[PDB]
Design an enzyme around this catalytic site. Sequence first.
Site, PDB file in Angstrom:
ATOM      1  N   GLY A  46      35.851  39.472  36.257  1.00 12.81           N
ATOM      2  CA  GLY A  46      34.418  39.330  36.436  1.00 12.81           C
ATOM      3  C   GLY A  46      34.058  39.036  37.877  1.00 12.81           C
ATOM      4  O   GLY A  46      33.062  39.523  38.420  1.00 12.81           O
ATOM      5  N   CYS A  47      34.879  38.176  38.443  1.00 16.17           N
ATOM      6  CA  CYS A  47      34.622  37.803  39.892  1.00 16.17           C
ATOM      7  C   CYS A  47      34.727  39.023  40.902  1.00 16.17           C
ATOM      8  O   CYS A  47      34.048  39.116  41.947  1.00 16.17           O
ATOM      9  CB  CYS A  47      35.461  36.517  40.187  1.00 16.17           C
ATOM     10  SG  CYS A  47      35.079  35.186  39.146  1.00 16.17           S
ATOM     11  N   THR A  48      35.776  39.829  40.590  1.00 12.57           N
ATOM     12  CA  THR A  48      36.004  41.019  41.394  1.00 12.57           C
ATOM     13  C   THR A  48      34.849  42.000  41.204  1.00 12.57           C
ATOM     14  O   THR A  48      34.328  42.567  42.171  1.00 12.57           O
ATOM     15  CB  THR A  48      37.352  41.682  41.023  1.00 12.57           C
ATOM     16  OG1 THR A  48      38.401  40.740  41.283  1.00 12.57           O
ATOM     17  CG2 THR A  48      37.602  42.943  41.851  1.00 12.57           C
ATOM     18  N   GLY A  51      31.824  40.660  43.138  1.00 15.92           N
ATOM     19  CA  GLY A  51      31.993  40.815  44.575  1.00 15.92           C
ATOM     20  C   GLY A  51      31.819  42.256  45.030  1.00 15.92           C
ATOM     21  O   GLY A  51      31.187  42.537  46.057  1.00 15.92           O
TER      22      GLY A  51
END
Length: 158
Positions: A46-48, A51
């Site tokens: 999710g973070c990737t 970003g």
Amino acid sequence: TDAVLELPAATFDLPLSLSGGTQTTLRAHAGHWLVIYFYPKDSTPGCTTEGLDFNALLPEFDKAGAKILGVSRDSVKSHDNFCAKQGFAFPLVSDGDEALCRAFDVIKEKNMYGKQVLGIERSTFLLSPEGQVVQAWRKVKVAGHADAVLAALKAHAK
Ligand code: NA
Ligand code: NA
Ligand code: NA
């Protein structure tokens, strides 16, 4: 009046360690819009995704004179590796002590595992050129999020 969140005065003077080895402060961003997006962990799905979504929109944020910062409590080296692998062209704050996270009240508790468990809740904020927090998103839904943040920024910047 237009603030949705009040930060302690000292928050604006905290030294924020960035990917690449420099520091910034929120006060140093005076005069331009700043998007601050908090995420729980470098190099996770999710973070990737989040970003990469912001990264793709940088030229649109540039059109508005805005800067972006991502924030997690991962180390500078972790952030350097994440930025290099993904090609991010904006900085990541290594908030190892969670000082910035606490100021924005993004460390949330959940009663789980028979414990009181604290962690970063995915959250984003829009900081005006005069340092006011004028919009917040909490418990962020990654899909569509960066687009929504850009739209809100444009609406505010008028
Ligand atoms: Na990565
Ligand atoms: Na600002
Ligand atoms: Na909101």
